[PDB]
Ligand binder design. Structure first.
Ligand SMILES: OC[C@H]1O[C@H](Sc2cccc(I)c2)[C@H](O)[C@@H](n2cc(-c3cc(F)c(F)c(F)c3)nn2)[C@H]1O
Ligand SMILES: [Cl-]
Length: 138
């Protein structure tokens, strides 16, 4: 397994048609997972599965600018299960990140950070065993 938190450089940032794949297994009794697509210290796209927010499972997405979080976008469709292997695919499209989990579309997140070629890091954190993190062009 890879170390978590994991810092994956995205050389030259992201671009439409770029597909980022994260493979791992959710730990038993997991509480949270986070993907952070970052432009320097800003977080262009935070993707945050929460396994127990008031005894509900929810995916919270947001952007952090100058250390301030913005308006949350929440998705109650929750495809993760404690103890189980998963695949998160983040496809960069011209106007949003498109996320599929286990080959099923999950959500889209409109680009708030617009300098895509400056979003040059993906951080992976939380309650997972991380198997691989990679990217390719489709
Ligand atoms: O809006 C989104 C944010 O919400 C709250 S901050 C807040 C409070 C009130 C109103 C508003 I607007 C925002 C969270 O604390 C933020 N978070 C989560 C993680 C995190 C770290 C890790 F190391 C993990 F492994 C992990 F899974 C998650 N770091 N930061 C982020 O999720
Ligand atoms: Cl959290």
């Amino acid at each position: 397994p890879l170390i978590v938190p994991y810092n994956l450089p995205l050389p030259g940032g992201v671009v439409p048609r770029m597909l980022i794949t994260i493979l791992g297994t959710v730990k038993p009794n997991a509480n949270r997972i986070a993907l952070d697509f970052q432009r320097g210290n800003d977080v262009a796209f935070h993707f945050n599965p929460r396994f127990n927010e008031n005894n509900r499972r929810v995916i919270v997405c947001n952007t952090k600018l100058d250390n301030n979080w913005g308006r949350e976008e929440r998705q109650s469709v929750f495809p993760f299960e404690s103890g189980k292997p998963f695949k998160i695919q983040v496809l960069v499209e011209p106007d949003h990140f498109k996320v599929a989990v286990n080959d099923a579309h999950l959500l889209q997140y409109n680009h708030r950070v617009k300098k895509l070629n400056e979003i040059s890091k993906l951080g992976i954190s939380g309650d997972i065993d991380l198997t691989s993190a990679s990217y390719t062009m489709i």
